[PDB]
Amino acid sequence: MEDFVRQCFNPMIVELAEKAMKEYGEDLKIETNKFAAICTHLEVCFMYSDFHFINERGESIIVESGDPNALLKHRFEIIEGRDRTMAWTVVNSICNTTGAEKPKFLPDLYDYKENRFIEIGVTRREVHIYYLEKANKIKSEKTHIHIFSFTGEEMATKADYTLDEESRARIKTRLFTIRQEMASRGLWDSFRQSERGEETIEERFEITGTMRRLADQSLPPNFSSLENFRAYVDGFEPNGYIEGKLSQMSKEVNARIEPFLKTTPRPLRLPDGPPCSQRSKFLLMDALKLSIEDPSHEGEGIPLYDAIKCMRTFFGWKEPNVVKPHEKGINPNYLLAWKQVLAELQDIENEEKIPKTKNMKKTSQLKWALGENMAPEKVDFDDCKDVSDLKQYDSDEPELRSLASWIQSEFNKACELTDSSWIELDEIGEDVAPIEHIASMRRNYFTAEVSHCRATEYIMKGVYINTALLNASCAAMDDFQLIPMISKCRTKEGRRKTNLYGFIIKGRSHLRNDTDVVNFVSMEFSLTDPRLEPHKWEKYCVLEIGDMLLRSAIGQVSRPMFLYVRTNGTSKIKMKWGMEMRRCLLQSLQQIESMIEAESSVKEKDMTKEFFENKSETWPIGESPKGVEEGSIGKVCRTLLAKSVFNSLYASPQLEGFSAESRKLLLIVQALRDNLEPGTFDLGGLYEAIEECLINDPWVLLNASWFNSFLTHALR
Amino acid sequence: MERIKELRDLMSQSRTREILTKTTVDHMAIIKKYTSGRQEKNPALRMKWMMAMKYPITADKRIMEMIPERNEQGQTLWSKTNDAGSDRVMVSPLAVTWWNRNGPTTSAVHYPKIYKTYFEKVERLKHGTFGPVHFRNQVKIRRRVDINPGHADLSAKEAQDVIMEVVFPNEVGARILTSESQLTITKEKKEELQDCKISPLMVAYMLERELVRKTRFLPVAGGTSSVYIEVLHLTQGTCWEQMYTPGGE
Amino acid sequence: MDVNPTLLFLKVPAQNAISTTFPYTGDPPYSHGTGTGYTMDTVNRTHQYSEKGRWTTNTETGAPQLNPIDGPLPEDNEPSGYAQTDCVLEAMAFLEESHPGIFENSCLETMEVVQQTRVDKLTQGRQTYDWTLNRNQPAATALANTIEVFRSNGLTANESGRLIDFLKDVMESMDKEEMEITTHFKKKQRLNKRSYLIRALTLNTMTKDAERGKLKRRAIATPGMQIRGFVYFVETLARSICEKLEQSGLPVGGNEKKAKLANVVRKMMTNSQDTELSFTITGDNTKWNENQNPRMFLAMITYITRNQPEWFRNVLSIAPIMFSNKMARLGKGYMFESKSMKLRTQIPAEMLASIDLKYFNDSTRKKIEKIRPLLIDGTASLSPGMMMGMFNMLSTVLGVSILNLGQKRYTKTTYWWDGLQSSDDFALIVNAPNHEGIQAGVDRFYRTCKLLGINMSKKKSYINRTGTFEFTSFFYRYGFVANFSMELPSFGVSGINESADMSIGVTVIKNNMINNDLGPATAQMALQLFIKDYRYTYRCHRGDTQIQTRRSFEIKKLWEQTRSKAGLLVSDGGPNLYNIRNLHIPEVCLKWELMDEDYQGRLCNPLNPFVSHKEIESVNNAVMMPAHGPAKNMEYDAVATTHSWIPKRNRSILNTSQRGILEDEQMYQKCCNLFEKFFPSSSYRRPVGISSMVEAMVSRARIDARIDFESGRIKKEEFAEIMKICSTIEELRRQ
RNA sequence: GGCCUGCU
RNA sequence: AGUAGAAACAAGGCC
C-alpha cells in the first residue's frame, strides 16, 4: 500500500507525515493505512489553505500563484503539520490575541473573516455521521466544522461554507482521484476500516551480549549464571541460616566489654626530642609597640606615613649588629635587609606624599631571604631518568619534638588584661525589643571583659597582617612589597592610639593552588633577650637595634631593644583563615553565654549581672602548685578566647586528630564520672590513635599535657 | 524583526548552523549547561581573593555603552576583554556603585508588588508589638511546620501551571486549570503584573515561592503558626521566651 | 598559676562544653600533591581484607577479580569482607517480614520514576569522570560529550529523550567492535571493545580536602557517565525503601535525626522495667566502604525486586554488575625531585605498571609491588568492595536490616537491641536483664555484623549506660546539646556576591539561633563581626570614614549625593540596620522606605548589565559545602539588585589544548539565548520534543509576526519581510 | 627585552 | 633557607 504514497504525493507531505508518524512512537511497517489516511487529511488541509489570500478587506483574494508583493497574506493558516507543542502554542497564541475560546482538541486551520478555527476531516464513512461524531467529541464548540467524504458530498452546520465553491469542486475531484486510483490498486478490503485505536506497548530492557557475561561473573562463588542465581533467590526462604553460622563461627570473634574504672586510664605519653620551637607568624608575648596617639580609626589612615611617624617617636637608634644568629641562614642578609628597610623608609619620608603602598628593590639579600629562583625547574621524565639522585619528594613523619615550658607561659600571658581596648565594634540597628536590650547588655559586659585582653590584640594583629598580605599578594604578584605591622587601640583616658610592631616584606606570590606558598620576611621590635630561651627561636635571627627608656622607680631601666627577624611563609587558605580570627570571639562568648543561659534556666531570671559583678561563682581554669585555681566568669571568657585564638594560630592536622581522639576519651571519662558504667572494646587502640597525633606542634603537645593534668585531677 | 535577524546571522556561519540543525529541542538543557567552568569548592576564599583584583566581576557587553570607561580621576570602570566562555566583559566593582549614583533611573514602584513575600514580612514586623521576656526552661520539641506564610494551598507542580499561565500564557500546552482557586489567582496576578518588566524568570520564581507550600522540620516550643514561625529565632530561645504578636493579628 | 581550659570540664560536664573541643577556627588540613599513594593503599587494603576469597579473570575485561562471598568464616576480630549470601538473604527476608509490602511498593514507585525519568536529570550532578577526555568534568559537559560520541557511532536511541533509552544505548555500546573518540592537541582515535569496556567501568580517584577530624588524608572516587543512570535508579529505590524505615537516618536532615534518636532511646529505656538494664553503644564502623561487596548489593536488589517485571529487575541489576567489575584510575601520578641537578619531574600514574621502582621509597615501592598484578591499562581492578560511599542508601538498608534482626522475635533470648544506623556510624541501645545478657547481646550483634561484611571499630567505639551517647557529632546527654562549633566556618562571607553574601550571612545567623541554640548577645556579636568582614572584603565601608580603598571615592560621592543616607545598602557604604528582630528580612526590603527614589531606581533597574539569571534552579540557591558533611544547597532570600552580579570565571583554559571548548560554550550560549528569546519559557520549564531548533524558531517567527500584526507594532511590509526571511533561512538550512 | 594565565 | 607534612610550594606554559 505504501507504493501509493511513494508514487502520488509530493515529498513535503510525505516527510511531514513521517515526522507525525514518529511523533506518537508507533512503527509504519505494521499499519500503513493510517499513514495514507492522515496524509490525505494533511493534503486537503494544504490544498484548502493555500491559493487563498486576503488583503486589507475581507473577501479573500484568490490567486493561482502568489505574485511578488507584500500582499501574500494567507486566508487560512494551518494548525496541523506541526508538533503537539507547537500546535498548542499556536492555539494559545490565537486565543490570547483573538480573544476567542480555547478548544480542547487540535484544530486544523484559522480564518480571519469569521475569526475562528476549522477542523477538517475527510473520513471514509459518509459525512452526516462523522460530523456529529467529532462534534460530540468536542464540547460546546464555536469553531465551525466541515468534512467531506469520498462519495463527493459536503455538509456543515449553519449551512456555512466559508470560501469559493470551485475550491470545493477541486477538493472532491482530488477525492475521487484518490478513490478511483485505489480502484486500480484495490485497497477497500481494509481501507474503510483499518484503524481501531490501538495504544499499547511493553517496555523491554534486555541484558544480552557482553553485558550478560559480566552479569555471569558478578555472582557468589558457586553460581554459574544470573538466571540460576535469580531462580535460587526467588526460591530462597529463611530456614535459620544465621543461627547455624553463628554456632559454627569461632568464639574468638567477640566484642567483650572491658570495664572502665578510675585506675584504668593511663596518662598520655608525650614525644621526646629537641624542645619545641615557635611557629607563629608574629611575636605574641614579646611584642613591642611604638605609638603616636593619633585620632584615626583602625582602617582610617595611610600605613607608611603612620609607621614612619611612630618610628620617629623613638630615639636611641644604634648601628645594628648580630646577637643571636639564625643558625641555618645568612644573618648578614638579615642585617642588610633591615638597613635597607630603614634607608627606603627615609627615602619615602623625603619625597612629596607618602605612597599608599611601596615596592622595594630586589637585591640579592631579599632574593635569598624570600627564596627566589629556588624552585627546581620543571622538566620531562624522558630527559631525566639516568640521574641517580632523582627520587620522590621527602614524605615521612615529621621530626619529633618534646614540649617546652614557653608555650605555657605564652598562653598564661595571652589571657591577661591590658591597658587598652583592642576591639572597636561596628553599629547595629537600635534595639527595639526587651530581649534585644538584654542581648545588648550581655554583649557590652563581654566586650568590657575581653577588649582589654592580649587575645583580642593578637586577633587584630593577625587579621590586619593577613589581610594586607593577601591584598598585596593578589595585587603586586611580582614585586616585593613593604607593609608595616599596624594596630590601633584606645587608651584608658579615651585617646586613640596607633602601634607599630614592625614590618613585613612580601615576596613573589604567584599563588595558583590553595596550598601554594608565599614567602615573606618579618621584622619585629622587642625587649625580650633571646639568650634565655634560645630553643624557642630556632628559626629566628635576632639583632640589637637600639635602647629604650621606660619610666620606672629604679632610676630608669635603659633596656636593650632587639629586632626579631625571620623568613616565614603562608598560603591563600592560611591567609583567608587567619583573616577570620574574629570568630574566636564568637566561639568563646557563645560558650560563656550558653553557660549563663543554662544556669538561668534554673533560676527563673537573667543571671548575667551578678555573674559579672558579684563574682561569687568560679570555675576551675588552671592549676597552681598549691592546687586547682578557680576564676570568675570573666577569666573563663578570656581563657576560652585565648584557647580559640591559639587554635586559629597553631592550626594543624595534628590538632584536629588529637582533638577528635581526645574528645572521645573525654566523653568516656565523663561517663565514668557520671556513674554510667562505661565500657570499652579496645582502649589501647584509642590510646594509640591519640598518641600518633602528637609529633612536634607546641599547641597540641600543650593540649595533651593539659589533658593529662585533667585526668590526674579527675578520677577521684 | 531583530530576533529572526540574529537567527539568520547565526545560520550564516557554518558551525552555528550545524549546532542549530542537528541539536534537538530536548537536548536544549544539556547544551545550555555545557560549560568548562567547575563549580567552586571554596567560594569564600576566592571571593576574598578575586575582589583584590581589578575587574573582578562580569557584566553584559551593553555596559560599554552606558558607563564610561573611566571615572573622574581615571579609575577604570570596565574592560573590553570578554569572559572565558561568554560574550560578557569583566568590569570593576566601581561600575556597580557608579550605576547607583549616575546610572539610568526607572520607576521601582512595582517591585513591592512583585516581591510580595519580603514586603509582607516587613509590613508584618513593622506593626508587631513586643512583650516582657520570661526566663524559664523551654521544652523545645521537634515538629514539622510550614515556613511560608503566604502559601495558597498549592504544591510545586500544582502551582507551576498557574505560574506559566500567569507569565507564559502561550507555552501552557494542554493544561487548562480546572480549580477555581487557581482561576482567581491567575486573574489577580495577571491584572496586577500586566506590564511589569523585571524579568519573566524572576516573576515566575517569586510566584512559585509565594503560592507553593513548603514545609520543614524545626525545634519549636509553642507557636506552630506560619506567622509565628518566621520569627521563631526572636520569640523562642534556650532559657527565655519573648512574647510577640505580628502586625497581621 | 598556669591557665588550663581543659580543667573547666571538672565543673561543667563534657557535653555541656563540648564546643571547646572543636578547633574549627583555624585552617583545615589540605592535601598538597598526588592522591595516587592513597588510591593504591586503599586498593591493596580492600584486596587484603578479602585475601581468603577466590581469584578469577574476567573474560571481557581480562582483569583479575577477587570474590570473597561465601568464603571462610572469620576467626579473628580484624576487618573481613567475607559476607555470606544466605545470611544476608535471610536478613532481607526478615526485614520484609517485619515490614510487609515494603519491597513491592518501593519497586512500584521506582518503576514509575524509571519509566518516566528524563535524560536531563543526569545534568543535575557535580563533577563526573568523562571518558572521552579521561578527566573530571561537569556532569552536563560529560553527558553532552558522551551523547555526541554515541550519535557519531550510530547509537541514537537517546534521541527519544528518555533515561531508560540512554541506558539501552549505553549497554548496546558494550557490544560494539570499534568506537571512535575525538582528541585535541582534532584527531579521531579508535577504541576497541576491551579498551572501551575498561573506560566505561573505570573510576577517577582524587584526594579529599577540607576534611576535619583526622590526621591522615583519604582518597575519594568519581564514576563515569555510563553508570550514573543505573546508580540514580538504584539510589531512588533505596531512598524509597529507607523512607519506610524508622531505624534509618540517612535520607533525613539533622533535626529529624535528633528526633528519631530521642524517640528510640525513650522507647528502649522506658519500655525496659526495673529488672532490665540498658546500655548504649556509640559505634563507628572501621573500613565501612572497603568491606561492602557489590555482589551482595546485587543479591539484595534481586531479592527486593522479586515478582516484578523482568526489565525492571535487569535495569536495577545492571549497576551492581558494573560495580563488581569496577576499575579505579590510580590518580594524578607522582612528582620526583633531584636536588643534585636541581630539577623536578611529574610522571603520570599510568606508568606505574612498567616504571622501575628505584625512584620510590620503601612504602610506595611495596604498595606498587602489591598492586601491580591488578593493573590493567593504567587502572587497577577493585572488584572486592565499594570505594567511597556510592551506595550509601543500600549500605544503610543493610545496617537497618541488622538493627531490626534483634527485635526480640529473632533473638530468641531475654536480651534484645535496637538503635539507629547512618552509614559508617550507629547508636545501638541494647537491653538485657543482667550484665551477662548485655554482653551476650552485644557479642551476637557483632558476630552477625561480621557475617554481613560489616565491621565495628573497637578503637572508636564505647558502651555506657543509656542517657549519654554520641551520633554524627550530635552529643545526647538526657537531651541533645547544641555545639555551634560545627557551623562556625559558615559565619563568614559565603562568596557568591554582595547581596547573596549578606542574605546568606543573616540567614545563617538566624538558623543557628533557631537550631544550634545560639545566644542573643552572641548572635549580635556575630552580626557585628560579619558586617565588619563584609565591608572589609567588598571594599564597601560606611562612607563617612576616611578609609581609602579602590572603591572609597564613588562610595563617598554617592554618600554625599544621597539625602536620606539611612537607606543606603551596606554594599554601597550605608549604615547597618540589622538586629535580632531583622535577621529574616532582606536588606533591600528593610531599607526600602528609607531610600531616595533616584537611588532606589538606579539600584533596582531591570536593564542593569550586571544581573544575570540562567535557570529557575540557580535563581536564589547557593551551594555551601558544610564543614564535616556533604555538599548542601540553601535557599537565600534576596532581591535582584545591581549587586547580584556573578564573579569572574577561571580563564585558565586559554593556555590549554582544550581551548576550543570556550568557542563551543559561546556558540551554545548564543543559540540558547536566541531560543529563549524565541521560547521565553525555556528557562523555567525545560522544553521537550523531538524537533530541531531552527524548525521551532522559524515556525514561531511565522506565527508571532502574523499575530503581532493582527494587533501590534508589526506592519504588512515587516510581516512579509519576516515571512520571506523565514523562507530564506529555510532554503539556507536546505543547503 | 617584548606579550599570555592564575580553580582547567 | 623557609612554609608544610605521608606530597607539595618555593610561578607555569607558549615563542
Author numbering:
A (entry chain A): 1 to 716
B (entry chain C): 1 to 249
C (entry chain B): 1 to 185, 207 to 756
Paper passage:
Central to the replication cycle of influenza viruses is the viral RNA-dependent RNA polymerase which transcribes and replicates the viral RNA genome. The influenza virus RNA-dependent RNA polymerase is a heterotrimeric multifunctional machine composed of polymerase basic 1 (PB1), polymerase basic 2 (PB2) and polymerase acidic (PA) subunits, that catalyzes both primer-independent replication (vRNA to complementary RNA (cRNA) and cRNA to vRNA synthesis) and primer-dependent transcription (vRNA to mRNA synthesis) in the nucleus of infected cells. PB1 houses the polymerase active site, whereas PB2 and PA contain, respectively, cap-binding and endonuclease domains required for transcription initiation by cap-snatching. High-resolution structures of the complete viral polymerase from a number of human, avian and bat influenza A viruses, as well as influenza B, C, and D viruses have been determined. These structures have revealed that the polymerase is a highly flexible macromolecule that can assume a variety of distinct conformations, enabling the polymerase to perform both transcription and replication that require different initiation and termination mechanisms.
Further 3D classification of this map yielded four maps into which models were built, resulting in four distinct polymerase structures. The class 2a and class 2b structures, representing ~78% of the particles, are similar to the class 1 structure; however, the flexible C-terminal domains of PB2 remain entirely unresolved. In the class 2a structure, as in the class 1 structure, the priming loop is fully ordered despite no template RNA being resolved in the active site. To aid in map interpretation the programme deepEMhancer was used for low abundance conformations. Both the 5′ and 3′ vRNA promoters, but no capped RNA primer, was observed in all structures. The 5′ promoter was fully ordered forming the hook structure bound by PB1 and PA as observed previously. Only eight bases at the 5′ end of the 3′ promoter were observed, four of which form a duplex with the 5′ promoter while the remaining four are oriented towards the polymerase active site.
